[PDB]
Structure formats: structure tokens, C-alpha cells
């Protein structure tokens, strides 16, 4: 993730111009290789036309150039690319919203799972750790960065998310499917035990805990579903073929022809297809943004900070339910007990 | 479902090019027959024009070709196809989200339906099996693959989803409508019996069970509703007619005319309508993707893995509520009891 | 509703071609009269030009034809029609989702309203009947088919949805507004009485009943709101005028002119405006689909099966809460007590 | 609101033609003045060109007309207008859904706030009146029609929504912000008092009451938010300027030039820019529909019936919670105790 | 925020014309500098062409002007700008809806946290202050205006949102991440203490309090998420480059050429590119609106009134839970105890 929200807080005279100087997360970084390849093929064709081909071959090449310039418009590149990019961006933001966060759960646990003794600390810490462990399991399933951080379950155990007895129980479970859900079942069982023990003081608190657990588990499952059900491969293939075929057609039909032949709209030889290069920049860049966003759990610059989120979530959960439990400041009268640096339209 | 999420985790230089070599779930697999038929008709017309027709017939054919090339644009193919494909894709993802999953229910059941004896196991297993049975009934109603797997209720009984006494009760029920909802009513009655027996320890736990059951049942009903209320037949007919009429018009108007006649934009005979073939590829492929996605419960490559989901859901449910019930590891102090391979914009 | 979901389960070679042979719910059925009228006016104009008008009148008519062919594009028909049709289709699916269903309520009632005696049956049956009666009242308010089935409240009483004492109470209520909500208030009062009687065993069950009742009542009210707040009349008028004016302009400007005059793009007299007829087919058909979908509660082929849904809902509700109450098969060990015809991307 | 839902229940041969004869809520009513002004300016320019200007001035005017006809397309009128109108329509339907309705609250109150004596009637009536009063306060804040009906709080008191003691408490509250929320706090306090008194029999009923109250209050607040956060003024200014500049350009460039000069596409003087008038009709009408819908709480024909809704809501609430409380017909066996005027795709 | 909702309550003859005279929040204010710069560069180029260049240089410049006028259309400015602006506007309204409001919480607290003594006042005031403090912490994290108002935590303490003992606890918490969530954990702990003390009379009231707290905390977290996950930098760069390159191309290709050369569509020298200036106005203004809306928490005219909302929320919360607690007017019979200044379609 490359944040620039502060740089654009106000609409200024040089508003988005200063963002053109950024390299990390930029279009230049994603596109300079493809732009160089396109320019190289174009200049190879141009050099062949200018220096290699004979006169009759040049006339045939000019006819082919005019033909391909005229009929390259039949490719619905904008049509297919717009549909694809809209689909990808919608999936991208939805996938970000699907990352499980322990904040609601840690608030409920701190308010509902009681006891200053070691057993209450154990209960709260273990419930939050089960939530974090489910998040880690699904994230290493769906994110290449998290997988590189946790390539084995041994790594997860060594990171403190799973104990060794829990590891024995986890691997002893007979299932051929992804086991990210197992800590959620552990959470339900442990919450039931805590309620039966009296650590959870009422059935409504247990119900609230289970509801928040199910929200968290639903987010994990939604991450799994997005990972499994890709954007349909046929759409990806079609948009890739549209871009490729259109720009090969442009490699042919955007060539500068000899102005001495008097071809219409061919009388200025600039030797560099600046507008064709710009059009490639925009269309291929749109496709590259979809390429980067289609799996936001990879290791692109603008891909989500999954490992950072894991660390933040674990630290904040443990702070909230262990250090902060029953640790309020004394009830104090505030400053305005006895009370800077629109009403409506029709009034 | 053809997953390629890992292949596109990062935006690479050969980003989507390597996906063009895939055959299963590809545009080539869905479109090669139609492309061959279009090319065959085009070449039949071209051969007739080149070898069969007389000179005056050729002149009339050339006039007709110019006319149809000019006025084929009056067909709003892009207009109708874009609307249709957007509608289909939205319905497709919504339908995937409507498939019932037992994960929330299994967590609630494991946390709320109690007893290590055989009767508690029976309660938990039977509740999860009722959920799975409702899912199977609606899926065999709406999915051709699931129907081929369960062509009769006898098959459902032999798969273990329904017992024979339950089969007698099920077929003895007098209804002319789909009975997918019956196991949900069985679930409500059994949950009430469990609460009355004391296996469910509180009324809030029963309420949570019923709420999750109603979420599951609503997903089953939404599957039924999507199956019943098709995309309006008139839209399908209109987009099919638009594509067909436009490409018959192109079969006429994209023909290569004799360059000796000096017709404008007709001076290069390439003998193969490469750009017309590409345009057919893209437009007919868009329509074929809608065709494949319109019923995502069939047996296309990218159709949903309904039978796999049935098997996974049943196995995971039975694991969660029977093997994993009250089977926690002992409460253990974690690694960070005494504590790898952004704050905000305005700060 | 004309369902064809099974016919399109798989994307086949003759995928959507076989749907072109359907008549019920088809574009041909909705559009053949308008297409005939357009063709008749076109041929009347063509006959007048070919046989009636003098030479100077023909020259003026040709100038007018060229003018209207050129400047008919100034009408933003595609612009207005696309907006209108998207709005209509979104409202259409939302309206289908707003039809009240008793399934959640019948599950809750079967699980919460208890007693095998006649009084418990009376309670459950009456609660489900109040829900069904509210649905019937709003549906006959908003659906012409349901109104034809229930043109008076006497018809509703004779159908068994309302008793005669309930009819006296209902008509004795002093209100000038639609009374569809009255059975929902009856439902709340009866649920409160059942809880006070002990038939509902706990306050959380009563709360769940009231929440599901409020979901049902909200769906009825949303049906009323969609019926009241039409698509803005000005949009309907504007799109109708756009279509009409554009196609009158085409009646003028698509006429075949005498090829002997050497007008550009006028040298082939086909005598039948096949592409203009196709364009009318597509644009007027789009408008006709919006026309049919704008009120999905009428008696069009693809309009919702409201009376079928009423009958199904009543039958299923009465089955669920009366025949199926406390009628479980004995708890039996399933087939897999001692256990046919993807893990993740980063693994 | 101008309802025509019944007129379009079925797609008929004269489907939308009969809606063109309506005047209230029509495009003609909203647009005839602007259309007359545009036509008057056009005819003033045409008269000046035809009768006033000299020959050289006519030649310069013709050159200017050709220039402005060519380059008026550079104004992205369709681009900006489509975005703006989509935004406005989405906000419009969302704003309608945000109007608070007391139906859920009246059902809950009738089912939960008990007592046939005068005190129970007082409780139920006062709770529903607090809800209605909050609705009235926010509506007179946001709706000009409701403000004209209630220009002072004295008018609200005289309408029976607020008592005089409540008026003293209301105006004695020290706040510079809109006080629409005050009756909701009164509602919470009164519900707590009723529960403490025993009129509300259980804590779950109180919780349900507070949840429905918070839904109602959230709808009131959402009305306030929509009133405050307008569609960004810069979008309104930009679309207004786009329309105005484009149609001034058309006033210049759509003028009929002397056909004797042989200007291309200028050889038929119709003296009336029928297609330009139609284009103005459609584009300016689109803008006028956005103008009417942007504040749906004004006094346009298609603006919401806010005062009617206030009256209906108050009457129905008082009927539901006072006249209908504990006023059920005796539990009676229905007609089908001993039982007119689709199963699935894969079956 | 620049509200003009009242000015557009009705669609009037001078409907949006009167909004063109506004300066604050206007397009003129956001765009006059860029428009002046574009016009200055255009006139510099025009002066060079008219007065500086030689005849052969003029001919080459004219050829370049024609080339750039023709091929500047290859830049998909409308394509990229429309996508970007739609994304920005959707994020903008979602971000407004994400601002936390204490209204639901203050209603619940006033109805559930009891006691007229000083301790009950302390409880209610402190809970509402914790909510407000969480809102302030996240807002100063995400909003530059709120940060300028609260550049240090000392400023927050001096504003009364945080006490000094709470400040010691807050800074003593060991975390490297944003601590906006800490007052929510304080809220949960204090609510648990109040329930254990008997100030909260039932477990369902505590559950409702925790649910509303979690809604509030989720809104704060969603503000953090929107601040962190910017609109992808590559989209911003691409749209900025598209606009810039297109309008530099127009600086070249919109130049008025010498009409004596007889270039087609170059025969009227107006010396001022009025239509090019208008096109720049619209396209660059669209981009500037996205620029202003992309971070709606800055200090633009139409940016949200975050500090006003902070003050309003705190004042209203303290009024609702302290001044208004258990302060009802006596239950009084209303005016209509013994009872001004549509039924359905199918009836
Ligand atoms: C292939 C072509 C496309 C790429 C070229 C795009 C421009 C090149 C990058 C800009 C310079 C780097 C950013 C920067 O560092 O530059 C900020 C500069 C001074 O810093 P600041 O504090 O003003 O911010 O200010 C500004 O760029 C503000 C003024 C910018 C001009 C606004 C447009 C109006 C004039 C129209 C000209 C024709 C095209 C639009
Ligand atoms: C009818 C025409 C359309 C169909 C033809 C499309 C292209 C043919 C398929 C590509 C080869 C198969 C995929 C593959 O196996 O090929 C991966 C290759 C090496 O493997 P890798 O490890 O680099 O990945 O790498 C790459 O293809 C990366 C470089 C690709 C070029 C990027 C475009 C920039 C140049 C512009 C040229 C004009 C059109 C865009
Ligand atoms: C005004 C013009 C528009 C209307 C005319 C549209 C076509 C006429 C209706 C088609 C026949 C009735 C449907 C049917 O009963 O026909 C199914 C047929 C055999 O039955 P089946 O078991 O194969 O299915 O199969 C098939 O139609 C499959 C092959 C269809 C061809 C696919 C397109 C590729 C070739 C391009 C030709 C140019 C236009 C696209
Ligand atoms: C500036 C130009 C635009 C404005 C002019 C639009 C037309 C004028 C208004 C129509 C008459 C008033 C409505 C009415 O009262 O008229 C209903 C009429 C008989 O009553 P009914 O019971 O049949 O309904 O029926 C019908 O209008 C049904 C037949 C209508 C024709 C359908 C189109 C097919 C023919 C194509 C002609 C070229 C343009 C589309
Ligand atoms: C670069 C060009 C674009 C910018 C120029 C746009 C117009 C200039 C601003 C208008 C005057 C300031 C607003 C105002 O204060 O002016 C309100 C005026 C009298 O006040 P009121 O009480 O009537 O409101 O009334 C009215 O402007 C109502 C009548 C307005 C005419 C409606 C259009 C129909 C005629 C078509 C003309 C061609 C273009 C559309
Ligand atoms: C861009 C993409 C990559 C490269 C490439 O694909 C697309 O670009 C294509 C363009 C082709 C050339 C077009 C024109 C001619 C003239 C012809 O002359 C006929 C005889 C003559 C004598 O009188 C009649 O007038 C000889 C062949 C030649 C040079 C083609 C060679 C192959 C080329 C380079 C193709 C190559 C594979
Ligand atoms: C399609 C919709 C329904 C029908 C209809 O509306 C639109 O279509 C319109 C077309 C009109 C005709 C256009 C051309 C001429 C030539 C003119 O000749 C001038 C003199 C001449 C002598 O030298 C100068 O050259 C005489 C009149 C005539 C025939 C029009 C008659 C009315 C018609 C049929 C209109 C009719 C009401
Ligand atoms: Ca990525
Ligand atoms: Ca399929
Ligand atoms: Ca209809
Ligand atoms: Ca209005
Ligand atoms: Ca801003
Ligand atoms: Cl609850």
C-alpha cells in the first residue's frame, strides 16, 4: 500500500502534478518494460521500412499500414477493458473490507470475559489468539507474502499464534480441506467453557461473543471465497488478447509513411509515435492496474500490508484484553461538568 | 471453477500473457466452434464472389457489400451486450454468495448444543445434517451437476444426508412445491426439543441458533429465487439477435472486393478478415461468457464446484460438531505472556 | 415469469440460438405490432415517393431525406434509453426481493409457539395466517392479477385468509389509508398473548418472533413504497419521446432514394430498410422490456407469479406450523457415525 | 409524487404513448419556458441573419456558424450530464428510503407496552407521538412544504405533536444545533420508565423497543445528513455551464445558412431547427429532471408527499397502538382446518 | 461543506443559473489559476506563430498543428477520467457515512445507565466522552483541520475530551500503532463496571450498549481504513498524465492557422480558443472535483465540517445523557385523545 492521502488533502494549483514524481507504486514502475518493448518493436518495423524494404515492398507496406490503421478500431478494447477494470476494482475494495479485524472481538472480550487472576488473563488472551490464528491461517492460504512468512505450520507455532498441544490437535484432525476455521470452533468451545465457569457472567454476553466471532469467521471465509472464485479466466484472456491484438495492429498501422507519396493524413514524419506511445501508456497501464489489483494479497507496492496487519492486530488485541482489562482511570468530573487553535435548508 | 489467483499475485512483465496458454476454462474452448463456423461462411461467400459470380453479379455484390459495411453500425451490439453482460456478472457473484454454508451454524452448534454422551453427539450431528440436507435439496433443484449426483431422493438417502424414517416423513408431506425448506423446520423443532431437554442451556443460545438457521434457510431460498427468476428472456433473445444479425451483416460487408475496381478503402485484398475475425472473437466471446455465467450451476469449466462444496461442507460440519466438541487443548500461557522469515495521513 | 434456466445451464455451441424459437415471454410477442406499424408507415412513405410525387417534389423529398438522415443522430436515444433501462431493471429485481415470504416466520413459529393441543395449533395457524393476510392485502393493492383474484375484501374472506369476525374488526377500523399493516399488529398482539399464556416459553423467543414479523412487514411496506413512488414520469415521457421522434426521423431519412440521382451512399435500392428495421427492433425492444418490467406485478408473461406465490406461501406455512410441529423422526445415528453417480492459491 | 404505476402494469401496444398526454409531473411543464426562450433566441438570430446583416456580414456569420457547428462537440455535455443525473437519481431513491416510518415501532409498542387502563394508553400514545414529533422536526428542517405547514414550533404544538409542557422543556434546552433528536431521547427515557414500572414486562422487549427507536432515529439523522451534504456545488455548476455553453454554441451553429452559397450539409432551409429543438428538449430535460429530483422535499409535482406521509403516519400509529391494542378477534379455526376468480430447473 | 439545498428545492425557470454566481465552493475558485496558465501558454504559442516564426517554420508548425489536432483523440481522457471520478465520488459519500455519530449511543446510555446522583451522571458523561474521544483521536489522525485544532494530545486534554489521569494511562500504553481504539476499550470496561454495580439494570441493556459501541468503533476504524488505503496511486498518476498530455496536445493542435493557406476547417481566425477553453474547463474541472473530493477531510470549501461535527456531537451527547436524563414531562393526554396552514395502483 502506497498512501498519499495527506498530499491531496486540499485541491491545490499543483494538485496532482507533484504525485507524478513518485516511483514506488507508480505507473512508470509497472509499465516501463512493456513500453520499452512496444517502442523497440515499433522502431524495428520503422527501420525495416525506412532502410531494408525495396520500393514495391514499401508500397505494399504502406497499403498494409493504411489498412491496419483504419480497421484496428474494430477491436472493442475500451469496451472490454472498462468492464474488466470496473470488476477488478470492485473486487479489490470488497477484498480489503473482508480482512478480519479483532477490534470488535477485543472490545467484547474485555467487557465480557472477567477475572484479574491468571485464569481470566488466560481466557481473554487465548480467545483473542484463536481469532488471530484463524486470520493467520486464512491469510497464509490466500496471501503470498504471509505464506513466505509462514511457509509451514511450524513457523506459525514458533510465532506464538499456535501452541504445540494445539498443533497436535490441529494436525490430528482428519480433513482434506483448509483448516482456517478450526480456531473459530476452538473459540466457541472456550467461550462456552468460560460461560459455564462463570467468567462470562450472562448468556447475553456469550451470545454477543458468538455473534462477533461469527462476523470474524465470515470475514475469513469471504477471503477464502475471493481467493477461490477468481475473476473468470475467460474475461482475463479476452482483455489480454484485446490489448495485445490492438497494439500489434498499432505497431503496423501507426508507422510513419513517406510523405512524398501524398497519402492523406501522412505528410509529417515525426519518427516517434508520441500519441501512439501515449495511447499504449494509458490502455496498457489500465490493464496493468487491473493486473496489480486482481490479487491484492501479493507483493506489489500497492498490495495490502497483510503482515503489518497481522502484527498490528495481534499486538493491539493482546494490549486490549490483557493490559487494559479493568484498568480504568477513576471516575472524574470532566471539564464541562458545570457547562480552537447549520440548522437546515428550510430555515 | 478454474482458479488462477496465485499466477497473478504480482503484476509481472509477462503478466497476463502466460494465462493465454490455458485451455480449461478458456475463451478458445468456448468459442472455437463458432469462430470456425463464421470463418467457413465467410470463405464460402468469398469463394462464391471470387470464382462463381459473373461480372454484373460481382458489381451488384460489391454494391451490397459496401451498403452492408456502412449500415451494419446501426445495430447497437455494444449497447445491448454491455448491459446484458453487466447484469449477468452481477447475478453470478450474487448467486455464489447465496450458496449456504454451515460454518456459522457449526460454530454455534458446537458452542451451544452440549453433552459428551451419545445423545449430545446425536443432537449436534442431526442439526448439522438437517442444514446439509436442505442445502442438498435446493442444490439438486438448481444445479444440473448435483441433480446428476442425486437424481432421486433414494440417492440422497443412500448418501447419508437423509435417513429412511426421515424419508417416510418427507414423502408423506402433502405439498406440490419444492420441499427444500423441510429440514429447516426439522431443525427448528429439534433445537426447541434440545432447549426443552436442557442440552441448550439458555434461551439466548436457542435464539442465536434460530437466527443462524434462518440465515442459512434464506440463502437456500435465495438460490431458489435466482433459479426461478431468470434473466428476462427478452433480453437474452435481443442480445442473441443483435450479435447474430450484426455478424451476418459483417459476413456480407467485410468481404474483400476486387482492388481493380478502385473502391475507396478497398485496395488491399488480404483474403482473411483478420480484424473482422478478431471483432467476432471479442463480441461473440463476451456473449459466450455471459452464456456460461448465466447459470453458474451447470457443468461448465468455470461453473461452481457444487458437489465439492457439498462434500466439504458435510465433512467440515461433522468434524466441527462431533470430533471437535469440548476438545480444547489445556489453557496454556502463550509465548508473549511477558511481552519474520502507518499512523495516519495528518501526522 | 418465463424460466429458461435449465436450457442455459452449459454454454453450448447452439447456446442462445434455441431460445430464439420461444414465443411466450419473447421479444417478438411484445414487438410485432409496433414493428408492423413502423414498416407500414415506411412503405407508405416509400410508395408515395416512388409513385405519387412529381419530379420536383421528389428532389425536395430527397433533400429532406438526406437532412433527416444526417441530423437524426442529434437525438440522444442511446443516452436516455440506457439510463432508463438500467433504472427499471434495478427496481425490478429489488421489487422481486421485496415480496414477503413466510419461511423465516414459519420456522420461528414452529420452533417457538408450542402445544400439540387445539389451542397451540390455533395459535400457530393464526399467526401464519395473519402474515399471509398482510401479504395478500398489499399484493392486491399493488398487483393487478391479485386484485382480479381478490376484487373485494369479501373475496379475501371467502379464500380463508380472513375470518368474518376479523372482517368486522378490519372494516370497523377508521382509516383512510391502506390497511395492509393491520394483520401485522394483530400478529404482535397475538404473539404477546401467547407469551403471556406460556405458549411462547421465553422472552427471547417473543423477541425473535417480533423481529421476523418486522422483517415481513417491512417487505410489505417496501412493496407499497415501490408501487407509490413510480419511476419519475418525466423520465418515462422523455425516453418515449426520444424513441418516437428518432424513429419518425428514421421513417423520413432511411428512405431509399433513386440511385440515378447519384447521391452519395444512395446507389443501392433494396426497397426494405433491413438495418433500420433491425435498429428499430433493438431500440424499441429495449424500451418494451423496460415497459414490461416497470410494473412487474401486472399480467405480462415475465411478470411475477404473484397468485402462485400466494398459494405456495399459504400452503407451505400451514404445512410447516401445523402438520410438521413437533413431528420429528426419532434421533437416529447417521451413516457416518463411525467415519457419486482446492486448499488455497499460495500453497 | 405523480403515480402512474397502474397505467403501465402491462406492456401494451400503445404502452408509453398514453403517458405523453399527462401534464402534471410532465417534461412539458418543467421545460416549456426554457424551450420557448431557446426558440426565441434562435429566431432572433435567424431574423438578424436573414434580414439585417449585409452580404459581407452574412459571409462572416456563415463562417462563424460553420465553426461553431463543428467545434461545439468539444463540450462533454453527455459525459458530465450522465454522471450528474446518475448521482442525483441514486441520492433521490436513497432519500426516499430515509424517511422515518413508525410501522415497526407501532408493532413493537402494541406488542410490548401493556395495559388497557388510561396509563397504558398514555404510554403507547406518547411513545408513538415522540417518534412522530422527531419525524416532524427533521422534516420541517429539510422540507419546504413541511416548513410552510409548521413555520414555528407553536404550529407543531397546535397540531398536537408536542404538548406545551414538552414545549417548555424543548425550548429550555440549551443547544445551537438542530433539536430533532430530542423526542428520541424522551422516547428512551419513557421506555425505561415503562420497563421499570412493569408496563414493559421484560428486558428483551425494552431492548427491541430501543433498537427500533434507533432505526427510526437513524433515518431522521440520515435525512439531516442528505439535507446538509448537498451534491457538490462544483458538479452542479459544471453541468449547468456545460448545458448553457453547448446550447449557446448551438444557437450559433445550428442556424440555417443560405443554400445559394453551396455550403456542404447546408442546402435545405427548414427555418425551424427541429432536431436542434429536440436535442435541447432531451438534454435540458435531463438537467431539469436532476434539478427537480436534487431536492425531493420541495414542492415540485414529483417531490415526495411529506405532509401526507406525516398525517398518514400519525393516524396509523395512533390507530395501531391505542384502538387496536389487545383487540384481537377470538381464536377461530380457519377454513382449511381440515385440509380463483415450478419446482426447479434441473427437474 | 457548501450547502445550497434550499436554493434548489423546486425546479424553477432560472433553476441552476443562480448557482453560477456563487464563489465559495465553486468551479471558478478551484480552476481559475489552471485556466489562466493554459490560456497563457496558448497565447504564447499563438504569438510565436503569428509574429516570430519564419514562413517555412510557419508551414512546418501548421503541419504539426494539423497532426496534433488529428491524433490527440487517441488519448482516452474521457475513458480514464470517468472511471476515476466515479471511484472518487463513491469513496467520498462512503467516507461521509463513516464519520462516527454518538446519537444512537446517547439514546441507549440515557435509557440504560441510571441514577440521578453524581455517580450516574459521571457514568453517562464518561461513556459519551469516551465515544467522543475515540472520534477525536481518529479524526485528528485522518483530518488536517482536526489535526491543526489538536496538534498534540495536550490539546485534546485541554479541550476536555481526555483527563490527565486518562492521559497518563493512554501514553503509558506500549503500542506503535494508532491508539484511537483505546477509549472504546475503556467504554467496554466502564459499561461492564456499571452493569456489575447495578447502574445498568439488565444484561440485555449491557449487550445493546456494547453493540452500539461496536457500531461506533467500526465507523472509526472505517475512517482509518479509508485514510490508509488511498485510491491507487497508479490511477491518480494515469488520469493526471492523461489530462496533462491531452491538453498539451491541444495547446499545439488547437492553434488558429493562417486562413490564407486554405487548410480545411481552418478559415476563421477567432484568436481565442473558446471551445478549447470550454473543453479544458470541463475536463480539468472534473479532475479538480476529484482532487477536492479525494480527501474530504482537508480544508477545501466542500470538505466536511469535521471540527463543527466534533463540537456538535460533544454538546448534544452531554445534553442528552446529563441534562435530559429522567427529565420527562408528565404523561399528558394529547390533543387527539378522543379522535394545515393514495391507496394503491390496482384500486
Ligand atoms: C507527456 C505529457 C504528460 C506528462 C507531463 C505532465 C507535467 C509534468 C510534471 C509536472 C512537474 C512535476 C511536478 C511538480 O513538482 O510540479 C509542481 C509545480 C510547482 O510546485 P507547486 O508547489 O506549485 O505544486 O506546480 C505545478 O506543477 C502546478 C502547475 C501545473 C500546471 C497546471 C495546468 C494548467 C496549464 C495547462 C498546461 C497544459 C497541460 C495541462
Ligand atoms: C491475435 C493477437 C493477439 C494474441 C497474441 C498475444 C501474445 C501471444 C502470447 C504470448 C506468449 C505466450 C505466453 C508466454 O509464455 O509468454 C511469456 C513470456 C516469457 O515468460 P515470462 O517469464 O517473461 O512471463 O513473456 C511475455 O510474454 C512478456 C512480454 C510480453 C510483451 C508485453 C507487451 C509489450 C510489447 C508490445 C507488443 C505489442 C502488443 C502488446
Ligand atoms: C436477422 C438475423 C438475426 C436472426 C437470425 C439468428 C439465427 C437464426 C436462429 C437459429 C436457428 C434456430 C435455433 C435452433 O434450433 O438452432 C440450433 C442449431 C441446431 O441445434 P443444436 O443442438 O446445435 O443447438 O444449432 C445452432 O444454431 C448452433 C450454431 C449457430 C451458429 C453460431 C454462430 C457462428 C457462425 C457465425 C454466423 C454469422 C452470425 C453469427
Ligand atoms: C416530436 C415527435 C415525438 C412525439 C410524438 C409521439 C407520438 C404522439 C403521441 C401519441 C398519441 C397520444 C397517445 C395516445 O392516446 O395514443 C394511444 C393510441 C390509441 O390508444 P391505445 O388504446 O392504442 O393505447 O395508441 C398508440 O399510440 C399505439 C401506437 C403507437 C405507435 C407505436 C410505434 C410503432 C410505429 C412507429 C412509428 C414511428 C415512431 C415510433
Ligand atoms: C460560457 C457560457 C456558459 C456560461 C453562461 C451561462 C449563463 C449566464 C449566467 C446566468 C445569469 C446569472 C444567474 C441569474 O441570476 O440569472 C437568473 C435569471 C433571473 O432570475 P430568476 O428569478 O429568473 O432566476 O433567470 C434565468 O437565468 C433563467 C433563464 C435562463 C435561460 C434558460 C435557458 C433557456 C434559453 C436557452 C439559451 C441558450 C443556452 C441555454
Ligand atoms: C507488428 C507485428 C510484428 C511484426 C510483423 O507482424 C506484426 O509486422 C508485419 C508487417 C509485415 C510486412 C508488411 C509488408 C511487406 C511488404 C511485402 O511486399 C509484397 C511484395 C510487393 C512487391 O512489389 C508487392 O507490392 C513483403 C513483406 C512485408 C515486408 C511484410 C513482412 C512481414 C511483416 C514485417 C510482419 C511481421 C511478422
Ligand atoms: C414520417 C412521418 C409521417 C409522415 C410525414 O411526417 C413524418 O412525412 C413527412 C415527409 C413529407 C414530405 C416531404 C417532401 C415533400 C416534397 C414537397 O415538395 C416541395 C415542392 C417542390 C416542388 O418543386 C420543391 O422542390 C412537397 C411535400 C412533400 C411530399 C412532403 C409531404 C408531407 C410529408 C409526407 C410529411 C408527413 C406528415
Ligand atoms: Ca497484486
Ligand atoms: Ca453455466
Ligand atoms: Ca409488467
Ligand atoms: Ca424538488
Ligand atoms: Ca479535499
Ligand atoms: Cl438479543
Numbering used by the authors:
A (entry chain C), B (entry chain B), C (entry chain A), D (entry chain E), E (entry chain D): 2 to 340, 347 to 348, 360 to 365
Task: Copy the relevant paper text.
Under both 1 μM and 5 mM Ca2+ conditions, most of the hBest1/hBest2 particles (~90–95%) were in a Ca2+-bound closed state, which is very similar to the Ca2+-unbound closed state. Strikingly, however, a small population of hBest1 and hBest2 particles exhibited a partially and fully open neck, respectively. A fully dilated neck is present in 6.3% and 12% of hBest2 particles exposed to 1 μM and 5 mM Ca2+ spike, respectively. This conformation resembles that of the previously solved cBest11–345 and cBest11–345-W287F19. Critical conformational changes take place at residues Y236, F282, F283, and W287, concomitant with the neck residues I76, F80 and F84 turning away from the ion conducting pore, drastically dilating the minimum radius of the neck from 0.8 Å to 4.5 Å and revealing a hydrophilic ion permeation pathway through the membrane. In the open state, by sharp contrast, residues 346–356 (yellow) and 369–379 (red) become fully disordered while moderate density remains for anchor residues 357–368 (blue), indicating diminished binding of this region to the channel periphery. Moreover, unlike the static apertures in previous studies, the apertures in hBest1 and hBest2 both display a distinct conformation in the presence of Ca2+, potentially representing a partially and fully open conformation of the aperture, respectively, as dilations take place at position 205, with an ion-like density captured at position 208.
The bestrophins are a family of Ca2+-activated anion channels consisting of four members (Best1–4) in mammals.
